[PDB]
């Protein structure tokens, strides 16, 4: 603990994204929004707009 900031430990995590000519298996939460009924809304279910 008695070191300078340059010598103190730092935990590093590197996120790399492997994008091949293969199906994506990781996607974003896609901004899960609440359901609204009995009101004219612009809906999108699983990409179906």
């Amino acid at each position, epitope marked *: *603990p*008695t*070191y*300078g900031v340059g*010598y103190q430990p730092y935990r590093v995590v590197v996120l790399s994204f492997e994008l091949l000519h293969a199906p994506a298996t990781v996607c974003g939460p896609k901004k899960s929004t609440n359901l609204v009924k009995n009101k004219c809304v612009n809906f999108n279910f699983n990409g179906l707009t």
Partner: antibody
Amino acid sequence: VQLVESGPGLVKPSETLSLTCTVSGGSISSSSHYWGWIRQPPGKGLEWIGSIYYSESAYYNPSLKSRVTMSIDTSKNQFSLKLNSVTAADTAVYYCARVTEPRWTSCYFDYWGQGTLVTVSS
Amino acid sequence: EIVMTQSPATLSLSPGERATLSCRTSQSVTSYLAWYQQRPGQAPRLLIYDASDRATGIPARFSGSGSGTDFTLTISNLEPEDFAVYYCQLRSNWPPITFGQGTRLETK
């Protein structure tokens, strides 16, 4: 800065030797310095006993670790040393010093205290 | 084990000359070293840290050859009050904070 030692000057064999070092030139709660104890028998070389950090923990000698403990008190701004089962080989002058360990192996005692002579005899 | 060996045990030189104390570590790791001076009846005084850095208040005549396993403290111009016992101190992994056997510098 200054360091002053305090404690009984006589310890009977096979008993705990207690010492307390009080500093007044700075702060022991600083996160840049250790506070250590270094002893030397009369006419002999220096022997680092142990160094304590402000939080609680400390590290000691690989020979005296069984019968040694260190404590700290930020409120009173002083750190203490206990040496259990003192034999006749502990008859020595004990200084308390200020340690700076910046990189890995850089560990020097910046300012020493005058030290007190504890002679262990019956 | 990283054992510390200083040399020589006693050094006989007169004021005006230059003294060369050697502090070699075992055949082992290499990094920094600290040199301390201790006069009779006084607590040891820090002379040099990080294998050559004059402490706060050390004259320019003190220097350190901070190099491999072997280290060297050099005193350019021996002054009358520069004759004392000199200890080199390392901080290895195990044992931590090893001290040298000490070099006694006296007036020939």
